C-alpha cells in the first residue's frame, strides 16, 4: 500500500536507525533476562523485527493494524517497567518519533 | 490546522460519541474511586475532557502531539488494570478506532 509500504520505508527504517531501539529489534526474551512474571503481566508481546518481518509477509490489512503492533509494543514496555527506567525513556522517544512520523503519512 | 482541526472535529467527536468512552470523559478521579496507588502507578494522567480542551485552546504544536495524549490516555488505563478488566477492552476498542481515524487524517 502507499500506506504500508510508508510504515516499512519511513516509520520501521527511522526508527530502527535510532541508537534507543535495539531492546526491540527481537522479541524480549524473559528467559536470557530473567523475567518469570514477563508473560503473565505482558499479553500480547511485540517487538520491530516481528513488525518488520509482518510487513514484509504483508500480514497487515491496513496502516493502522501495523500502528497499534508499534502502540503494543511500546505500551508494554510502559506496564512491565517502572516510569523512571531508561527503557521506559527510551520508549518514550521513540514512541515519539513513531507519531511524529504517524502524522506526516500519506492518506 | 487542517490535522488539528481534524483531531477536534473527527477523532476526539467519533470517540466521545462510542459507547464506550464514558469513563475517559473526564479525568480519573481517585479520590471517588479509591484508588490510593492511581497516582504513583500512573506519573501522567490524560482523558478525553483534558485533550478537547487542549485543541480548543490551542494547546497543541502539532497533530502528533496530540496523538501523544492519546496514547497516554490508553496507555494509563492498561498499566494501571488487570488485561482481562472490562476498562482495558473498552480502552482496546477505542484505542483501535483512534488509530483507524489516525490513519485516515490528511496531511
Ligand atoms: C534486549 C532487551 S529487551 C528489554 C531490555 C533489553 C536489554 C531491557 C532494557 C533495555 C535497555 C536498557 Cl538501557 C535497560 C533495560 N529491559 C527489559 C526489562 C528488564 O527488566 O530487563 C533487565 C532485567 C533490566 C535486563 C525490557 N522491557 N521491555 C523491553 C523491550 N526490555
Ligand atoms: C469513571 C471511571 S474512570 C475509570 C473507571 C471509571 C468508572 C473504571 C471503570 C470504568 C468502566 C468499567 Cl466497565 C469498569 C471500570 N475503572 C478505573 C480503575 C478502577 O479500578 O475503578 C474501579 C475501582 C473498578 C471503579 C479506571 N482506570 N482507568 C480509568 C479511565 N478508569
Known sequence: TNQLQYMQ???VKTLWKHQFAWPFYQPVD????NLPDYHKI????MDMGTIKKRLENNYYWSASECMQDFNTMFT??????????DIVLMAQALEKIFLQKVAQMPQ
Not at 524473559?30 to 533476562?33: G, P, Q, R
Not at 505482558?42 to 508481546?45: E, F, G, L, S, V
Not at 508494554?76 to 527506567?85: L, M
Open 42 to 45: 505482558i499479553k500480547n508481546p
Open 9 to 11: 520505508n519511513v516509520v
Open 30 to 33: 524473559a528467559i536470557k533476562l
Open 76 to 85: 508494554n514496555c510502559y506496564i512491565y517497567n517502572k516510569p523512571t527506567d
